[PDB]
Structure formats: structure tokens, C-alpha cells
Symmetry: D2
Subunit: 140 residues, 4 copies
């Protein structure tokens, strides 16, 4: 459903049932250095005051940054998982879409780093979220 990178033959939880499937995250482009995704704003994305939830921008950043790393390292026997996230909220989003662009800024052996920009339909930069992703040898 969401176009997450297909790196495994099966997954513990299907897209539609995940947080990401529930709120409607969809990945558009995906390369080792850059990934983009979007989501249509609906109440399920908002908090009680009618604005997109701060948690939604973080979740979209965490998924996109982590999965962009997974797309490269999994076939090398590595697992990749977000280790830290820092989000700044510059302006709220009331409706329309949120579009995320993840740009790889450092790729170390144990940690990758991505800057994610989150824009509204007018192209205004509404939030930024940077992700540090830990890369470790798969256990299983």
C-alpha cells in the first residue's frame, strides 16, 4: 500500500494495519541519498485543535529516514532502526497534504543521518525533522 522498500519475503504487520497505513503515509521516490513521501491530511492526522499532530510529522520522518536506510543495508545483512529524532515545528498544517523530503547527509558505518523537510501544498516549510539511524548486524 505505502510503497515501502520490498526487502523481505514477509513482514510482521501488513501496511493497512500499521500506524503508517492507518494515517496513510505513502513513499514516492526512493534512492540511497534521497527519499520522498506524502500523506493526505484527514482528522486521523490531526489533534483536537484541528491542526496536523506534531507526532505525525515525526512519524513520517522516522519511517521515511529509517526505511530509506533499510533499502540499502538490509541486503547487506544489516538491520536499521531510528535511534534519535529532533523535530522543529515552524508553522501548522490545517488541511491538504504533508510532503516530506529526506536528504542523506552522513552515512557512517554505525549511524546514518537524514534531514527531513515537511512542506504544505503551497510549498511552505512547516516542519523539519532530522533522524539519526543506527545500523547493526541482523540478529536473526
Amino acid at each position: 500500500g505505502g510503497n515501502l522498500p520490498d526487502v523481505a519475503s514477509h513482514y510482521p504487520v501488513a501496511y493497512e494495519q500499521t500506524l503508517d497505513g492507518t494515517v496513510g503515509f505513502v513513499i514516492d521516490e526512493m534512492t540511497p541519498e534521497r527519499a520522498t513521501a506524502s500523506v493526505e491530511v484527514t482528522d486521523t492526522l490531526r489533534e483536537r485543535w484541528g491542526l496536523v499532530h506534531g507526532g505525525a510529522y515525526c512519524a513520517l520522518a522516522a519511517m521515511l529516514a529509517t526505511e530509506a536506510t533499510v533499502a540499502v543495508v538490509h541486503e547487506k545483512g544489516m538491520m536499521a532502526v531510528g535511534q534519535s529524532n529532533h523535530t522543529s515545528f515552524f508553522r501548522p498544517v490545517k488541511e491538504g497534504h504533508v510532503r516530506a523530503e529526506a536528504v542523506r547527509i552522513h552515512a557512517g558505518s554505525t549511524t546514518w543521518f537524514w534531514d527531513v523537510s515537511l512542506r504544505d501544498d503551497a510549498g511552505r516549510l512547516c516542519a523539519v525533522s532530522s533522524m539519526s539511524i543506527a545500523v547493526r548486524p541482523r540478529r536473526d
Copy 2:
């Protein structure tokens, strides 16, 4: 509902339709200095690898921190919204619950700061999330 602070006669989005109500966040205690909330793990809270989504710890921290601020400042004519968030992920959660405790560490005239601990059912510290909350005069 989620027991969010009842400060206004009408809210733009009903609890059950918000992201918060969708994933099942509920506030337990709330005072000016400290607040606690919890959620049952379901697939809606998970990513496709079967663990609680990074976004979920951040979303919980953000609502809890911001709303504990609203609880104080709203009746004073002020609006409060998360301005930034920094989250670090120490151990995953596969199932059970996530419990948040938010401790106010600074209450400035324009900015309030909260540290939020996220623990599993064994009590282990799985993530921490710092929230900075902007406090501004309410627009009419």
C-alpha cells in the same frame, strides 16, 4: 475520551477521530508540574516490523507535554503548541503498553520545557522525549 484537559466549550476534532483517539492515548494524571499518560500497544501503534512506531513515542510526548501546558495557560488567554521535540530511542517495545511521564523542568513566559519518559510494562526506559512548548497570546 482521552481525558484531555477540558478548557474549552468546543474542539475542532472529537477525541475518537484525532490521531490520539485513533491510537488510544489516555491521560492519567495532570498537574502544573507533572502529567502521565498511557496507551495499549495494538497494530495501529506499530510499524511493519512489529515494534511500536518511533512516531508513537513522539506523538505521546508531544500531546502530553503540550496539553499539560494548555491546562495551565488556556484560562489565562494563552495558546500553547509544541515548538520542538527531541526523542531518543533506547529499546523497542513489541507489545503490552507504553507509559509516559512528563516532568516540567522550566516554565518561562514564552516557553515551557518538559522531559518525557516512555516505559514498557516491565518498567524499563525505552525512550525519552524532550518537548519545548511555545506560549503565545491567543488570537481572537
Copy 3:
């Protein structure tokens, strides 16, 4: 001096006595959207392991970001001060120089945000540092 923006007739501390002058920070370019600064590595910039001190990347980012804000807002009756900083360390620097480039990404009425890149003499990205800058009316 360090070529900091000349916005006032008197400053409480002379360049050469500040932390900035002590370690040798110097601003090269400064515009409303972008500013650059550099420092020669000396032992004064190092920790006891012989590498550039973590604090030094943060100090450089903080002065550069805040002062690029002062450069705009001071003549408008506003004071600007760093409010938060997030720094990630990708590679150490043993010797040579550290070059900073600060790019303004949001300019709000109360908060400005800058991303600062810190590079070695080979051009490699050694650290990044995000600064949030508070902008408030100047106290008389």
C-alpha cells in the same frame, strides 16, 4: 576582531577577551539568509585527546547563527539569543581549521532557525549544528 556585526556603539566584552576571541572565531560572510565563519585549530580548541572539542563546533554554530540574527533584528529594536542547539558529530578534526556555514531555514516573528555545517580542510562534513534563535523586544 572577529568581524561580528557592528550594531551597537558599545559592547560589554571586547572580542579578544570573549570565548570567541580566545579560540579565534572569525566571521567571513554575512547576509540575512546565510553566513560563514572559520577558526584555526590550536590546542585551545582541542580536548585532551588532541581532537577539536565538541564544545567548539557548538560554540561556533551558536555565535554564527545568533549574530547573523542580531545583524537583521537589532536595528529593529529586537534582541536575539540562541534558545536551543542540536549538534551531531560525524568525524573528528585533529588539526587545520573548522569552517562553518549557516543557512537560514525559517525566519519567524519570535523564532529564527539556522542549519550550520562544520567542515574540515579537506571539505568533509565533520559536524552539523541546528540553532533555534529567540527574537524578543529589547529591554531598555
Copy 4:
């Protein structure tokens, strides 16, 4: 001079010559779970506006958190180095001292995490700085 943990027979740079020796950082208590340090404010610690430099609070946090980790892991064949820092500035310090308390919150196999509180002489919490420290096998 600064009471840094004595874990090696020699060091690349002597205390007095380091950033830390220059500005005057001194460690008081040091255990695996908690460390404290202070520094006397003098112009060398301040920026041109007469307030303690934002970089000074970060440097004191980075040193104290990293060195508290070094104190445990070095004798186990590990190196420890700060990997990220996030600092919030709640109130400025004009003079007197800055006192730092570092509290260990997580100790993983590859990353430790410390929260550092930075107080003035009245005991007010002026800044907080959290440090993530990478722990890796020594190379040499």
C-alpha cells in the same frame, strides 16, 4: 588541573592548554551513574554581550558526559566519544559560577545517554544539555 579521570599514562594535550583548561572546567564528583563539575565565569566564558556563551554550556556538558563514560569503559578496551548534543537555554548567566550535574539515563552497549543540568549560584536551572556518547572498541 581539572580532575579528569586518570585512565591513561599520557595524553596528547595537557589540561592547561585544552579548551577545558583555558576556560577553567573542573570535575568535582565522578561515578558511573553521575558526575558533577563547575567553572568560574570570567570574560573568557562570555560572549560580547556579557553573558556566558551558549558554547560554554555545551562544552561543559560534552566533556563531563563523555569523560564520565571514558572513566568506565576505557579500562575495558573501549573508546568513548560524544556523538550528539542537544542543549536548551532557559536563562542566561551573567557572573559567578556554572555548575553542571550529569546523570546517566541509559547505558547501552554502543551508546550511553546523559542528561546534564547547568545551574547558577542561586541554584536556578539555566540550561540543560543532553549528551549521547558512542562507545566503540579502541583502534590503537
